[PDB]
Design a binder for this molecule. Structure first.
Ligand SMILES: Nc1ncnc2c1ncn2[C@@H]1O[C@H](CSCC[C@H](N)C(=O)O)[C@@H](O)[C@H]1O
Length: 384
């Protein structure tokens, strides 16, 4: 698994976590989350009612004892060994198709990069990513010719994915806005913010609106949430998410969040779920980002943070979160905040790990908590 991570990053992890822990983290990072979480949209349905609906569809949702809005599905796999060499013709899936097949998706024709020319419908085939990673085994539903030419349709029925997570996007329950797939750490983040119907609230990197819509249901669609993002497309997706979930609580504004103080607003609550190197996201087939990215991105985040601090009322609260493992983007950037008149505060839910040499922030690790790598800091603005 070590091969998935560039050498300097591997050394970075070893230095930051220790060899043993670093190896455990990288090993687990290569795999999908063991517990696949969704958020119950309490704007439309209760937890137990939704469970009833999911059991109807043959699913086995389990309840979280920490998040009353949390449900998770247990992951299946690995369905074959890491060294397994099937005696099968090869279908090569592109980078994006391979990651979904790796988690139980079918392989569709646009997801096909190239393939063995002997392949005919009904043949048993093995599916590999462009770098030779075996991600699944299945049965071809197209001949070679159609597989490499079709613009749509089913190319390989994946009957033996490396791992299996439930597909929920096609469920009626999903279409009716009953839930939103979202990781446990991300859900804890919105809770730890403790939004109140009275609060002036800003999500300054909000799209596609996972944490924004969670705030909306915690507010029970009362008050107002200001949601910022620079990307019009991701905002477009956020508009669809809002409509589907029945969220009436949110005001979308497109802009560079680093210029936030240009508004006249002094917020009581700010969520900064910041753009990051995403070193913690799963599954991690091949890690492309490295040290140069950590420094650059950490520096990039400081612009957001400063903008947030200046836009916070005194006594105001900032929640900073990332889906990355790096020190610089996390504990390092919190020290920055501490130098700018912010103070660490106890988080209302703490089920993760302590931060690196730092007491009140909350970290999540894949090998310890069965989640994506994650980071959460909660701060109080004591002065300007
Ligand atoms: N300079 C900038 N100003 C505002 N938003 C930015 C930005 N640079 C990146 N972003 C946005 O920051 C987001 C980080 S992903 C955040 C996901 C979101 N909080 C959720 O829970 O669903 C991306 O959507 C990206 O569009």
């Amino acid at each position: 698994y070590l091969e998935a991570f560039p050498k300097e990053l591997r050394e970075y992890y070893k230095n930051l976590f220790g060899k043993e822990e670093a190896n455990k983290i990288m090993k687990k990072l290569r795999e999908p989350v063991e517990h696949y979480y969704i958020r119950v949209n309490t704007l439309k349905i209760s937890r137990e009612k939704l469970i009833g609906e999911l059991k109807k569809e043959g699913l086995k949702p389990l309840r979280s004892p920490y998040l009353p809005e949390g449900l998770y599905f247990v992951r299946e796999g690995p369905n074959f060994s890491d060294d397994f060499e099937p005696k099968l013709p090869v279908v090569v899936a592109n980078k994006y198709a391979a990651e979904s097949v790796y988690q139980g998706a079918m392989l569709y024709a646009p997801g096909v990069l190239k393939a063995d020319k002997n392949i005919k419908e009904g043949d048993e085939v093995q599916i590999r990513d462009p770098k030779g990673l075996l991600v699944g085994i299945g049965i071809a539903r197209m001949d070679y010719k159609e597989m490499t030419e079709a613009t749509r349709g089913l190319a390989v029925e994946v009957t033996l994915p490396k791992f299996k997570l439930p597909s929920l996007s096609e469920l009626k329950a999903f279409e009716k806005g009953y839930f939103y797939p979202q990781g446990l750490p991300s859900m804890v983040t919105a809770r730890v913010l403790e939004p109140k119907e009275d609060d002036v609230i800003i999500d300054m990197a909000a799209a596609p609106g996972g944490k924004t819509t969670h705030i909306a249901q915690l507010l029970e669609n009362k008050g107002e949430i200001i949601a910022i993002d620079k990307s019009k497309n991701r905002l477009r997706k956020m508009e669809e998410n809002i409509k589907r979930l029945g969220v009436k609580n949110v005001k979308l504004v497109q802009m560079d969040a680093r210029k936030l103080p240009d508004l006249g607003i002094k917020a009581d609550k700010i969520l900064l779920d910041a753009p990051c190197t995403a070193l913690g996201v799963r599954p991690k087939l091949w890690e492309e980002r490295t040290l140069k990215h950590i420094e650059a991105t950490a520096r990039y985040q400081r612009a957001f943070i400063w903008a947030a601090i200046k836009s916070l009322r005194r006594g105001g609260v900032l929640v900073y979160s990332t889906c990355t493992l790096s020190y610089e983007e996390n504990e390092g950037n919190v020290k920055f905040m501490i130098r700018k008149g912010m103070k660490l505060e106890e988080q209302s839910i703490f089920i993760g790990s302590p931060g690196i040499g730092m007491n009140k922030v909350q970290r999540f690790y894949p090998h310890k908590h069965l989640t994506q790598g994650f980071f959460i800091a909660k701060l109080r603005k004591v002065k300007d």
